[PDB]
Amino acid sequence: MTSAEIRAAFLEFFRQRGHAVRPSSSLVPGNDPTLLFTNAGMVQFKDVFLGREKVDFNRAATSQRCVRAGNDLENVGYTARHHTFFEMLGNFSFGDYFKRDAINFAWDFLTKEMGIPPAKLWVTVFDEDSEAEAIWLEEVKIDPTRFSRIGAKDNFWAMGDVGPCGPCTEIFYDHGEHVAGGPPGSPDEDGDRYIEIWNLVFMQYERDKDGNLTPMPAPSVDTGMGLERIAAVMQGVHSNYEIDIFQNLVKTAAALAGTTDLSNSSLRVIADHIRSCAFLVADGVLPSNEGRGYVLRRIVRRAIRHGYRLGIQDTFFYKLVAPLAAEMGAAYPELVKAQEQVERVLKKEEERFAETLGQGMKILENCVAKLDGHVIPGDVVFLLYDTYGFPVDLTADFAREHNLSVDHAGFEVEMSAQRDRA
Amino acid sequence: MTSAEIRAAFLEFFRQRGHAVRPSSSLVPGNDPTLLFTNAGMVQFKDVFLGREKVDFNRAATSQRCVRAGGNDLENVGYTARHHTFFEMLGNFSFGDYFKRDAINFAWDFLTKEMGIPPAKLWVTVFDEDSEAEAIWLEEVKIDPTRFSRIGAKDNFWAMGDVGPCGPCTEIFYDHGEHVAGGPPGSPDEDGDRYIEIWNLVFMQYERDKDGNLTPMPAPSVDTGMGLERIAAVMQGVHSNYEIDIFQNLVKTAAALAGTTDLSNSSLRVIADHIRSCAFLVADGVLPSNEGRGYVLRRIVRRAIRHGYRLGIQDTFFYKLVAPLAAEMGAAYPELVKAQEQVERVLKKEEERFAETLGQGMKILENCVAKLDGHVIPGDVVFLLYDTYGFPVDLTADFAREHNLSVDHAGFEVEMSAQRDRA
Ligand SMILES: Nc1ncnc2c1ncn2[C@@H]1O[C@H](COP(=O)(O)OP(=O)(O)OP(=O)(O)O)[C@@H](O)[C@H]1O
Ligand SMILES: Nc1ncnc2c1ncn2[C@@H]1O[C@H](COP(=O)(O)OP(=O)(O)OP(=O)(O)O)[C@@H](O)[C@H]1O
Numbered sequence: 001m002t003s004a005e006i007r008a009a010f011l012e013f014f015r016q017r018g019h020a021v022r023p024s025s026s027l028v029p030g031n032d033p034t035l036l037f038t039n040a041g042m043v044q045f046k047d048v049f050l051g052r053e054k055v056d057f058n059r060a061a062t063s064q065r066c067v068r069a070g071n072d073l074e075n076v077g078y079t080a081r082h083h084t085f086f087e088m089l090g091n092f093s094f095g096d097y098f099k100r101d102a103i104n105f106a107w108d109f110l111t112k113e114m115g116i117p118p119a120k121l122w123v124t125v126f127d128e129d130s131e132a133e134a135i136w137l138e139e140v141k142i143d144p145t146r147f148s149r150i151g152a153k154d155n156f157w158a159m160g161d162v163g164p165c166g167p168c169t170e171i172f173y174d175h176g177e178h179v180a181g182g183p184p185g186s187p188d189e190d191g192d193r194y195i196e197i198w199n200l201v202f203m204q205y206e207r208d209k210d211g212n213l214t215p216m217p218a219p220s221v222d223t224g225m226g227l228e229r230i231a232a233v234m235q236g237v238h239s240n241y242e243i244d245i246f247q248n249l250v251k252t253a254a255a256l257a258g259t260t261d262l263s264n265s266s267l268r269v270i271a272d273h274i275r276s277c278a279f280l281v282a283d284g285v286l287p288s289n290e291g292r293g294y295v296l297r298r299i300v301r302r303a304i305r306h307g308y309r310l311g312i313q314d315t316f317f318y319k320l321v322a323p324l325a326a327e328m329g330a331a332y333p334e335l336v337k338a339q340e341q342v343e344r345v346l347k348k349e350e351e352r353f354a355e356t357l358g359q360g361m362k363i364l365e366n367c368v369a370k371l372d373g374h375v376i377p378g379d380v381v382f383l384l385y386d387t388y389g390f391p392v393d394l395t396a397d398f399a400r401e402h403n404l405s406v407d408h409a410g411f412e413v414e415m416s417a418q419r420d421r422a
Numbered sequence: 423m424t425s426a427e428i429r430a431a432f433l434e435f436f437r438q439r440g441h442a443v444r445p446s447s448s449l450v451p452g453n454d455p456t457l458l459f460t461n462a463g464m465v466q467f468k469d470v471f472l473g474r475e476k477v478d479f480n481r482a483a484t485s486q487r488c489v490r491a492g493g494n495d496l497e498n499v500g501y502t503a504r505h506h507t508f509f510e511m512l513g514n515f516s517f518g519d520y521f522k523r524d525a526i527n528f529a530w531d532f533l534t535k536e537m538g539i540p541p542a543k544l545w546v547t548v549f550d551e552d553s554e555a556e557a558i559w560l561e562e563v564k565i566d567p568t569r570f571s572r573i574g575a576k577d578n579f580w581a582m583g584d585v586g587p588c589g590p591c592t593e594i595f596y597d598h599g600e601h602v603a604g605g606p607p608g609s610p611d612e613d614g615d616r617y618i619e620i621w622n623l624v625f626m627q628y629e630r631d632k633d634g635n636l637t638p639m640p641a642p643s644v645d646t647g648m649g650l651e652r653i654a655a656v657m658q659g660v661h662s663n664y665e666i667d668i669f670q671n672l673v674k675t676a677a678a679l680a681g682t683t684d685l686s687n688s689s690l691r692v693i694a695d696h697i698r699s700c701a702f703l704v705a706d707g708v709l710p711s712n713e714g715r716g717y718v719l720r721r722i723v724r725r726a727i728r729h730g731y732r733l734g735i736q737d738t739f740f741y742k743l744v745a746p747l748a749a750e751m752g753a754a755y756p757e758l759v760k761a762q763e764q765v766e767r768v769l770k771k772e773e774e775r776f777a778e779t780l781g782q783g784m785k786i787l788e789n790c791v792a793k794l795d796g797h798v799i800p801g802d803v804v805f806l807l808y809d810t811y812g813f814p815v816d817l818t819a820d821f822a823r824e825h826n827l828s829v830d831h832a833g834f835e836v837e838m839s840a841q842r843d844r845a
C-alpha cells in the first residue's frame with residue numbers, strides 16, 4: 001500500500017465517521033508566534049481546543065506537514081524512524097467523543113482497515129489512567145502481555161504551563177527480533193524495534209496560573225500518527241527511508257553522487273533535508289541569519305556538507321526539488337506552484353555557501369588530523385562560524401562522524417569576546 | 423575501616439594539604455531562602471563561590487549533613503542500595519585556588535593510595551566537551567582508558583543557576599562486581615546498583631549572565647562531594663549502604679521493636695533512613711506542621727510510622743530509635759546529644775497524633791485495594807485519606823507502590839481545587 005493510498009484511507013475512514021477533512025496548515029504557524037515551525041496537527045486547532053476560536057465542526061481529520069528541527073535534527077540518518085520533515089495523520093475531537101471512541105477508532109483502523117495483526121502491536125497507557133486501561137483491557141480485550149503502564153514523562157501531556165492537559169495512550173508496532181530494541185518500558189525501549197505509530201492525547205483537565213487542576217469542561221481528543229512510520233509497516237520495511245515516497249529521492253541523490261550504495265547514510269540525510277528545506281521554502285521561509293530563516297540555512301548547509309562528504313562536484317541540492325514535487329505535488333500543490341522559486345532559492349544558498357565550504361573543510365580536516373583528545377576547541381569552532389559560515393551544529397555533525405565533540409562553552413566564550421570587540 | 427575513621431581520614435588528608443577543616447552547617451540553610459534543606463556541602467560556601475562573602479581561607483574541607491527530600495531522593499529509599507534522605511557529603515573546596523589538575527590528583531590519591539582501592543574497581547567519567555579533564559585523567563594520571571566514559575551535559579555539566587558560575591564535572595564510580603545488576607556509566611542500564619557514583623568533582627569554569635552569554639570565570643573554583651555511606655560500603659566490603667557499620671544498631675533496634683529477625687527487611691532500612699533525617703531535622707530546629715519545612719518533616723515521620731504498621735508494630739516506636747542514633751553519631755554531631763530529649767518528645771507526640779487516624783486510614787486503604795479493579799487508587803480515596811485521615815499523597819502512593827499500584831494524582835488535585843472553592 002503506497003503512502004498516498006494510506007493517507008487517503010486514513011482521511012476517508014474518519015470522514016465516514018463524521019470528521020470534517022481539513023487541509024494541512026502551513027509550516028509557519030499563525031496563531032502562535034513563539035513556535036518556530038508547525039510540529040503537530042494540533043497547532044492550527046490550538047485556539048479551538050482552548051475555546052478561543054469557533055468552527056462549525058466538532059470533529060476533524062488532517063494530514064499535517066510538520067518540521068521538528070527546533071527537535072529531531074540530530075536523529076536524521078542515525079535512526080530508522082526520525083525525520084525533520086514528516087506528515088502527521090490526526091483525528092480531533094473538540095469536546096465531542098473522548099477516550100472510548102478514540103481508542104476504538106484507532107484500533108479499528110490499524111487492525112481492520114489496515115489489517116495489521118494484533119500480535120504485532122503494543123499499547124501503553126498512563127500508569128494513573130484507569131479509564132484507558134479498562135477500555136483497552138476489558139472492552140477491546142487486547143493481549144495484556146503486549147501492554148505497558150508508563151509514567152508522566154512519556155504518557156502525560158500539557159499544552160503549556162496553563163491550559164488543558166491529560167493522559168495519553170500510544171500504539172507501537174513490533175518490527176520483530178531482527179531489529180534491536182525492547183518493548184515500551186524496557187531498558188532498551190529507545191531501539192527501533194518497537195516504533196511508536198500513533199499517539200492519542202486526552203485533554204481531560206485544566207491548570208490555571210496558580211497551578212490548580214480542574215476538570216476540562218469539554219474533554220477533547222487530539223491524535224497524531226506518522227505517515228512514514230505506518231507506511232513502513234504497510235510496505236513491509238524496517239526504515240522510513242525504504243518506503244515508496246523516499247525511493248525517487250534516494251535514487252536521485254545516489255545518481256548525483258555517482259554511487260550504487262543506496263545504504264550510504266548521507267543519501268538519507270540529503271533525502272530528508274530536501275523535504276524539509278523545499279517545503280519550508282514553499283511556505284515562504286527564506287535563508288537568513290535569524291529566526292526561522294537561520295533554521296532553514298542550517299539545514300541547507302548541513303545537506304550541502306553531506307554532499308561534500310559524498311564528493312559531489314556540482315551544485316546539487318536544488319535538483320532534488322523536481323522528484324519531490326513529482327512525488328508529493330498531488331497532495332501538496334503549493335510545492336508544484338512554487339517549484340521554480342524553491343529551486344532558485346536553494347541554488348543561490350548552495351552557491352553562497354560554496355564560496356567558503358571547501359576552505360572550511362580543509363581547516364576542519366586538518367584539525368581532525370592533528371587533534372589530541374576528542375574535543376574540537378572553541379576557537380576553531382568560532383573560526384568556522386565567524387569567517388566560513390559554518391553553523392555550530394554543522395561543525396558538530398561533522399565531528400560526530402569522527403568520534404569527536406565540539407567545545408560549545410568555549411565557542412560561547414569566543415562570542416562574548418567578539419561582542420567585547422564591538 | 424569504620425565510617426568515623428573514613429570521615430576523619432578524609433578531613434585529615436585535606437587538612438595536610440592546607441584545607442581549612444570547617445564544621446557542617448545546619449540542615450536549615452541561612453542566607454538562602456529558596457532552598458528547602460541543605461542538600462550539598464556547597465550550600466554554606468555558595469556566597470564565597472559567588473564572591474559575595476569573604477573568608478580567610480582559599481581551600482576548605484567538610485563533612486556536610488544533607489537531606490534530599492524535595493526539589494529529591496525520598497522515593498528511592500528502600501528501593502536502591504545507594505540512596506538516603508539524610509546522608510553525609512564529604513567535600514573539598516577550592517575558592518579560586520587550585521583547579522582541575524589538583525582536584526583530580528587529590529581525589530585519585532585518596533581513593534587509590536590512602537584508601538587502597540584497586541584501580542581495577544574504579545571507573546571515571548568526564549564531560550564529553552572537557553578536553554582538559556580527559557587529558558589529565560588519560561595522559562597525566564594515566565588511568566586505564568577502558569574504564570572511562572565521556573558523558574554529555576545532562577550528567578557531567580553543572581550550573582549554580584540560570585545565571586552565575588557553571589562548568590564541567592568529572593565523576594568517579596566503584597564497581598561492586600558481577601553479582602550486582604547494572605552496567606557502566608553511559609550504558610543503557612547505567613542506572614542500577616553495580617557501578618555506584620562515589621565522588622563528584624565540580625569545576626566552576628564559566629559565568630553565564632542574564633541574557634545567556636558565557637564568560638570565563640575570573641577565579642576558577644572547585645566543589646567536590648562524596649557520600650560517606652557509599653564509600654564506607656566500599657571500604658567495608660558490603661553491597662548496600664544499609665549494611666555499613668553506622669546503620670547496624672539502628673536496624674538491629676528496629677528489628678527488635680518489630681519482633682523480626684530479617685535484618686535486611688526493606689521496611690527496616692526505610693525506618694533506619696527516616697530516623698536519621700527526622701531526628702537531625704528536629705535537632706536543627708524543624709517542627710512538624712502542615713506547611714513548608716515542617717510538612718516535609720511530617721511527611722517523612724508519617725511514612726516511617728506507616729512502615730512500622732506494615733511490619734506489624736502496635737505500640738508507638740519511632741522515637742525509641744533516637745537513642746541509638748545519638749550514641750552512634752553523637753561524637754560527630756554533639757547537637758544531636760544536646761537535643762536528644764527534645765527530639766524524642768517531638769517525634770513521640772507526632773506519632774501519637776498520627777495514630778489517631780492511621781489504623782482507620784489503613785483499613786480504608788486495604789479495603790480499597792482488595793476490591794479494586796485496575797491499578798489506580800482513585801482520586802476520591804486519595805483525597806479522603808489526605809483530608810480526613812492526614813495521609814500525605816506520597817504516603818498513600820508509597821503504600822500503593824508496594825502492591826504494584828499507582829494513585830490518581832490528577833484526580834486528587836481536582837478534589838483539592840473543589841475543596842478550596844468551599845472556602
Ligand atoms: N521527527 C519525526 N519523524 C518521523 N515521525 C515522527 C516524528 N515525530 C513524531 N513522529 C510521528 O508522529 C506521531 C505523533 O507525534 P507526537 O509528537 O504527537 O507524539 P510524541 O512525540 O510521542 O508526543 P509526546 O512527546 O507528547 O509524548 C508519533 O507517534 C510518530 O509516529
Ligand atoms: N535499495 C536499498 N538497498 C539498501 N539499502 C537501502 C535501499 N534503500 C534505502 N536503503 C537504506 O540503507 C540503510 C542501511 O541498509 P543496510 O544494508 O545497512 O541494512 P539492511 O540489511 O537494509 O537492514 P534494514 O532493512 O533493517 O535497514 C537502510 O536502513 C535504508 O534506509
Ligand SMILES: Nc1ncnc2c1ncn2[C@@H]1O[C@H](COP(=O)(O)OP(=O)(O)OP(=O)(O)O)[C@@H](O)[C@H]1O
Pocket residue numbers: 462490495504505506507508509511577580591619620621622646647648649650651652
Ligand atoms: N540521596 C543520597 N544518598 C546517599 N548519597 C548521596 C545522595 N545524593 C548524593 N550522594 C553522594 O554524594 C555525592 C555528591 O553529590 P552530588 O549531588 O554533588 O553529585 P551528583 O548527584 O552527580 O550531582 P550533579 O548531578 O548535580 O553533578 C555523590 O557522588 C553521592 O556519592
